[PDB]
Every structure is written in structure tokens, then in C-alpha cells.
Design a protein around this ligand. Structure first.
Ligand SMILES: *[C@@H]1O[C@H](CO)[C@@H](O)[C@H](O)[C@H]1NC(C)=O
Ligand SMILES: *[C@@H]1O[C@H](CO)[C@@H](O)[C@H](O)[C@H]1NC(C)=O
Ligand SMILES: *[C@@H]1O[C@H](CO)[C@@H](O)[C@H](O)[C@H]1NC(C)=O
Ligand SMILES: [Zn+2]
Lengths: 586, 144
């Protein structure tokens, strides 16, 4: 009997046992989250430990089937998914040391305080709301000089341990390990390596650069109005003035940089709190929206076992979509009567529809095509549900409303601040991390290079000089909690590829920022043909089913923001566009 | 028997309103899962029609099935219902296999004990009330 048949038998046993163990683990976790007590923190740990032990044993005994004797490519995908080692390749001392380092780095972050304010909500309200240069500078430098100075040496040891863990797994470093999510082999025409993602990212940023130049110059002029004696008309933007602790998003700058301030944005909060909407009407509307394009209803367990309102007992009201397995879908969300919960409902139900789609694939083939598909599929629904045509078609806006060419610029500029202003940040951070894992930045130059790639790629300068006892990057949640960061770039490109394809299938004439895919079935057959695949196909094939190409592309992202680009080109007619890396505020 | 208080298992099926399924084409009785009821029909294929309960291609009786979620499931799990997962060859119409022998899937034999490539052939549905409609118990009775 060939070693392939024995693999098929081993796998159809594994699936049947893992389904049950995983269901009871996730049910324990949900019971904890919706009702915090002392008895529940233990019932969570019991099932968590059981599930982890099962997975360890099954991987150990799956390693006995060599992949070279298998011709079927689905059996190969599942066996690869199961044959992965992990920190099991290290020693026992080294595994325990790595876990101690990780826990210390996490708890140093989550309980840090300066003098007596914590990061949330103490120092975040000074960064999002204050209008004082000195107070903002104090909060910025205090968070930089209290927490990161403690996370430097732990991070230095983290790097060594992670690099050798990844090298013992037949990679070349930990960045290569991370990039191994976008790799395809064995398929003819749809192949992709771990060294080509760098090329694609750097090839698309070169085309995103001009719109960011124009937005940077506009924001600089407005901030120069607001902080008069502190900004230079040719230099970079000081780091502590961007309405954020790190500068990840430029959203909180809107109040200072609104084009036509005598025109208020759209906000239907009053038009719904005045018609007596509640927490269930929002989700009934979201279900109607998803049924309009031909996707199925929700299940009865969704309505019986979802927590859609804060029940006065404790709880964790973070919005979440739960897929417990065995036909069990849920949402945990303490929703209000507002215009942002109206949109979060559409996001989370897009998550749930994607989950329900691939519920027929074997246990290990149930995810997105790669790590940036769930969020894009969620985001396009909020794009298409916030359209004045949609808000007028559900009776939440008066038919005497008329869109104004000056009101479509406020909207596009707010979208730009949130969406475009974050891409140089992401690209630069993951580039620095990749170069540090590879070994191209020695220890004694870490902080020298960080603040050299901020003045070049992002256009941001630091108010005070930082020597090499600092670990500024580790003062961010994702860096000291051991998470990757390139899924946001690729997700932000995929969402506009998806939306252009779908609004082209829906026969939309006009600007892309006004399109609404409701009442379109031809736009709901193109999405489902990709949702139903799970991860049984290369992500390039699943991308080509919806779009027509098999790689990333930046042209629909630039088609979305075309009227804003023309307006900005006219606004910056007598300004300097571009920055100089020499001016510094000290 | 349409009203007995305890039904058998599908691998050990017995022989002697709200009918979710009444499809006409002795009285056999058992319990299966929701989305497997489609396999109780002539010319079907799966685990139930291969290793548990087979119907011939030229059949004359009827098939009745109805949900049982309020009787055959409990908070925590109901591990009293079983089905056969592995077998050396497909069944014959109306045949029955109550064996509990270790199934050898490779080339070296089992000593009658589990281990590498030797599997215990029976597996249980752990029934719960918070399951999807396709994973909830179903009571089935086949006539003639
Ligand atoms: C919350 O948990 C406690 C014990 O952990 C339990 O007694 C109580 O019934 C739970 N609340 C609900 C609504 O079930
Ligand atoms: C691979 O195996 C699956 C069952 O696991 C089967 O359905 C499929 O047809 C096989 N593919 C090929 C190319 O043999
Ligand atoms: C969808 O079609 C229905 C039925 O004609 C209509 O009432 C609704 O306004 C439409 N919605 C949109 C967004 O066009
Ligand atoms: Zn999401």
C-alpha cells in the first residue's frame, strides 16, 4: 500500500478528532468572554491545554510520511500544515528562555506608567486632543524614555533566539519565515517565492509616492498655520504633532485640515435615534444588505446565541465574529445607536459570510487565501454601505439631499488621512524589521537607521535626538508583542482591486468613490467563487477569479482618489512639494 | 417502532407528525447526523452508505426521518451514538457488521492493539444542543 493511501487515512482520522476538541475549547473561551468570573478562567485553561497537547501529538506522528511520495496536491497542503515543527526544534532551556523573554516584553508594555498616567487612556488623550507643543512633546518623550529603554535588551536577545529557531527550520532568518505565507510551489503558472514579495512592495510604493507628496505638503501648510513658530515650509513634519502616539494614522488631524469647514459631514445618528432604532434593527439591515447580492441569510443560532447588547455581569465588548465549528456562528458586540456601529455590523457580518462560505473544506483548509483576505472582504462592505445613495435608499437620509462637489472633497480627504497616510509607516517599519533580521543593520546602528528611514520614506523628523540606548520601534504594540505588519499594506491594495472589479460587474457609471453593489447578483457570484475555496488553491488563482490578474496592483487605489489628487495639485500651486532631510527641530 | 424511547446506532441498526423527511420509493431504526440523511437512498455513497448502512439500487419501501435535538443531546456531549469509519470493503444491501476489530491500514499487522497505522474503527457523534442544523441528531426509520 503506497505511502499516499496511508496519508489519506491518517488525515481523515485527524479531522474527525480535531473538530470536536476545537469546538469545546472555543466554547469555553466564549463562555469566559461573555461572562467574566473566577470559575471560567479555569474552564478556559483546561480545554486550551487539551487542544494544544492533541495538536502536538498529531504533528509528531504526522512527520513520518515523506512528502516526496505524494502526487495529490491537497494531501500535500494538509500534511505540510501539520508537519511544521516550531520552537520544538530548539532545546528545553532555549524554549523556556524564549517564553520568559516574550512574557516579560508583553507585561512591561501593558502595565507601563509615567509621571501618574498610563498609556490608555492617560497619554492617548494628550496625543489625540491637546493643542500644546510642550505638553505633547512631554507625553511623547516620556513614553519613549520610560518603556522602550526597558525593552531594548530583551529585544536584542529576542532577535538571536528567533533567528536561530528559524534557521533550524531550513529558512535563512525570521523575516524569511514570516514571508513564507505568500509562497506557492508545484502549480504551473501560479508560482510565487519568498523573495518576490519585497520586489512587489517596493515596485508599488514608487507609484504611490506622488499622491503622498501632495497630501504631505497640504497637511504641512495647515499645521504651519496651527503651530506657527515651529514648522519650516521645506522640511519634515515633527513626530509628536500627528494626532497619534506613533503617527500610524493621520485621522485626528481632520479638525485642523478640513477643506471647507462650513459644511458638516454626513452623520445619521440623529436620524436613527429619532426613529427609534435599536440594536437588532442594525443587524436586520445588515442581513438585508447581504441577502440583496445573493448571499444566504443568517442561522437561527446566530439570533439565539449572539451577544448583541451590553448586559449591564462583566464582559469584553470588543466586536468579534466567532466560528466555533459544527455549524456555530456568533458575534460578540455591545452595540449602540450610532453611525459607526451601523458600519461595524456590516464589517463583522462580512467576516461571518466568508466563514460560512468555506465550511465544507477539510479542517486544515479553512482560512483565507492568505493573511490579507478576511479584512479586505470585511472592509469593502463598509465602503459600499456608507454611500449617500445607500443611506438615502434605506430611508435614513432625506430625499431633499443633494450631493455637493465641495462635500465630496471633505469625504475624500478624511479617507486619505486614514488610508493613505499610513502606508509609508507600514512599509518602512516592516523594511526595518526585515533588514534587522537579515543582519544588515548591526546593533550599534539600530536607532541610527530608524531615524534615517523616517526622514526619507515617511517624511517625519524627531523633536529630540535619540542615542543607542533607545528602542523606539518596540514602543509599539505589534513590535514587542511579536506580530508581523505587512498584511495591512497588501490588504489595503486588495480591497480596492476587489471593489473595482465588483463595481465593474455591477455596471456603475461614474467615479469609483460613489459605487454601491447592492441589488447586484452578478457582483455576488464573483465574490462567492473566491470565498468558497478556503485555502485549497494558490492565492494567485483565487485573486484571478475575482479580478482578472494574478498579482498586486496599485492602479485602482489611485483611481479611487483621483478627484482629490486633482484638487491637491491645484491647491499646492504656490507651495514646495517634497521635503529635505536636513532641517531638524533641535 | 416509531415511538420507542431509545434508538440504536447506525452501525448496529435494529430490526423488527413532524416528519422532516418522508420519501417513498420490516422496520429498521437508527440515529444519524443531519446532513447525512441524504445518503439513505438507492445509489448513494459516503461513510454511511459504504460502511454503516447500504440500500440496494432497486428498492420498494419508504424512508422516514425527523429531528431529535431535544432528546438525543445534552450540555457536555452525548457520546453514546457511534458509526463505523474504516472497513476493508463496502457493504452489501441490508448487511450488518457489529465487529470491533482493529483496522490495519499498512503492511505490518496489528497485535490486536492500536498504534502506527492501526485504528479503532468506530467513532462517536458528540451531540450538543448548540450545534448547526446539519450536526444535530436525526432519527430514521426505513420500511421494507
Ligand atoms: C455568569 O457566570 C456565573 C458563574 O461563573 C453563573 O452563575 C451565571 O449564571 C452566569 N451568567 C449567566 C447569564 O449565565
Ligand atoms: C486528491 O484527493 C482528493 C481526496 O482527498 C480527491 O478528491 C482529488 O480528486 C484528488 N486529486 C487528484 C488530482 O487526484
Ligand atoms: C434595492 O432594491 C429594492 C427593491 O427595488 C429597493 O427598495 C432598494 O432601494 C434598492 N437598494 C439600493 C441600494 O439600490
Ligand atoms: Zn475585521
Amino acid at each position: 500500500s503506497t505511502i499516499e493511501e496511508q496519508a489519506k487515512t491518517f488525515l481523515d482520522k485527524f479531522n474527525h478528532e480535531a473538530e470536536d476538541l476545537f469546538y469545546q475549547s472555543s466554547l469555553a473561551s466564549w463562555n469566559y468572554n461573555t461572562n467574566i468570573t473566577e470559575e471560567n478562567v479555569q474552564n478556559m485553561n483546561n480545554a486550551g491545554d487539551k487542544w494544544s497537547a492533541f495538536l502536538k501529538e498529531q504533528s509528531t506522528l504526522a512527520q513520518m510520511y515523506p512528502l516526496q511520495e505524494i502526487q495529490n496536491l491537497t494531501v500535500k497542503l494538509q500534511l505540510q500544515a501539520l508537519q511544521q515543527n516550531g520552537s520544538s526544534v530548539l532545546s528545553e532551556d532555549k524554549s523556556k528562555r524564549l517564553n520568559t523573554i516574550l512574557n516579560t516584553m508583553s507585561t512591561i508594555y501593558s502595565t507601563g506608567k509615567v509621571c501618574c498616567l498610563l498609556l490608555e487612556p492617560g497619554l492617548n488623550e494628550i496625543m489625540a486632543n491637546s493643542l500644546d507643543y510642550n505638553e505633547r512633546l512631554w507625553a511623547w518623550e516620556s513614553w519613549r524614555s520610560e518603556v522602550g529603554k526597558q525593552l531594548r535588551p530583551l529585544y536584542e536577545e529576542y532577535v538571536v533566539l528567533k533567528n536561530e529557531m528559524a534557521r533550524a527550520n531550513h529558512y535563512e532568518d525570521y523575516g524569511d519565515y514570516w514571508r513564507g505565507d505568500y509562497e506557492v510551489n508545484g502549480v504551473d503558472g501560479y508560482d510565487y517565492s519568498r523573495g518576490q514579495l519585497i520586489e512587489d512592495v517596493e515596485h508599488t510604493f514608487e507609484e504611490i509616492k506622488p499622491l503622498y507628496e501632495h497630501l504631505h505638503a497640504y497637511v504641512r501648510a495647515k499645521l504651519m498655520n496651527a503651530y506657527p513658530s515651529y514648522i519650516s515650509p521645506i522640511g519634515c513634519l515633527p513626530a509628536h504633532l500627528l494626532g497619534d502616539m506613533w503617527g500610524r494614522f493621520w485621522t485626528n488631524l481632520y479638525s485642523l485640515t478640513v477643506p471647507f469647514g462650513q459644511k458638516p459631514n454626513i452623520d445619521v445618528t440623529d436620524a436613527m435615534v429619532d426613529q427609534a432604532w435599536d440594536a437588532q434593527r442594525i443587524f436586520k439591515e445588515a442581513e438585508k444588505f447581504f441577502v440583496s447580492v445573493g448571499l444566504p441569510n443568517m442561522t437561527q443560532g446566530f439570533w439565539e446565541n449572539s451577544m448583541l447588547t451590553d448586559p449591564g455581569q462583566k464582559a469584553v465588548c470588543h466586536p468579534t465574529a466567532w466560528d466555533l465549528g459544527k455549524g456555530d456562528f456568533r458575534i460578540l458586540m455591545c452595540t449602540k445607536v450610532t453611525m459607526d456601529d451601523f458600519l461595524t455590523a456590516h464589517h463583522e457580518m462580512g467576516h461571518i459570510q466568508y466563514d460560512m462560505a468555506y465550511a465544507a473544506q477539510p479542517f486544515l483548509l479553512r482560512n483565507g487565501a492568505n493573511e490579507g483576505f478576511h479584512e479586505a472582504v470585511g472592509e469593502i462592505m463598509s465602503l459600499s454601505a456608507a454611500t449617500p445613495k445607500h443611506l438615502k435608499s434605506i430611508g435614513l437620509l432625506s430625499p431633499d439631499f443633494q450631493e455637493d462637489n465641495e462635500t465630496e472633497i471633505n469625504f475624500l480627504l478624511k479617507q486619505a488621512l486614514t488610508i493613505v497616510g499610513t502606508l509609508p509607516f507600514t512599509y518602512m517599519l516592516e523594511k526595518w524589521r526585515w533588514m534587522v533580521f537579515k543582519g544588515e543593520i548591526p546593533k550599534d546602528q539600530w536607532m541610527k537607521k530608524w531615524w534615517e528611514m523616517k526622514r526619507e520614506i515617511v517624511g517625519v523628523v524627531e523633536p529630540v535626538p535619540h542615542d543607542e540606548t533607545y528602542c523606539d520601534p518596540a514602543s509599539l504594540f505589534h513590535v514587542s508583542n511579536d506580530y508581523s505588519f505587512i498584511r495591512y499594506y497588501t490588504r489595503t491594495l486588495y480591497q480596492f482591486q476587489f471593489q473595482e472589479a465588483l463595481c465593474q460587474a455591477a455596471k456603475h457609471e461614474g467615479p469609483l468613490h460613489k459605487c454601491d453593489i447592492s441589488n447586484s447578483t452578478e457582483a455576488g457570484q464573483k465574490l462567492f467563487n473566491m470565498l468558497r475555496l478556503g485555502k485549497s488553491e494558490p492565492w494567485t488563482l483565487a485573486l484571478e477569479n475575482v479580478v482578472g490578474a494574478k498579482n498586486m496592483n496599485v492602479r485602482p487605489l489611485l483611481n479611487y482618489f483621483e478627484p482629490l489628487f486633482t484638487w491637491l495639485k491645484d491647491q499646492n500651486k504656490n507651495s514646495f512639494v517634497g521635503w529635505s532631510t536636513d532641517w531638524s527641530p533641535y | 417502532v416509531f415511538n420507542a424511547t431509545r434508538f440504536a446506532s447506525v452501525y448496529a441498526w435494529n430490526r423488527k407528525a413532524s416528519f422532516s423527511t418522508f420519501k417513498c420509493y420490516y422496520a429498521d431504526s437508527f440515529v444519524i447526523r443531519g446532513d447525512e440523511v441524504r445518503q439513505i437512498a438507492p445509489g448513494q455513497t459516503g461513510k454511511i452508505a459504504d460502511y454503516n448502512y447500504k440500500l440496494p439500487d432497486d428498492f420498494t419501501g419508504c424512508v422516514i426521518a425527523w429531528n431529535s435535538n431535544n432528546l438525543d443531546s445534552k450540555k457536555g456531549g452525548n457520546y453514546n451514538y457511534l458509526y463505523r469509519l474504516f472497513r476493508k470493503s463496502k457493504l452489501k444491501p441490508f448487511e450488518r457488521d457489529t465487529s470491533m476489530e482493529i483496522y490495519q491500514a499498512g503492511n505490518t499487522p496489528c497485535n490486536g492493539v492500536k498504534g502506527f497505522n492501526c485504528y479503532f474503527p468506530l467513532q462517536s457523534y458528540g451531540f450538543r444542543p448548540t450545534y448547526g442544523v446539519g450536526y444535530q441528531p436525526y432519527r430514521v426509520v426505513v420500511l421494507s
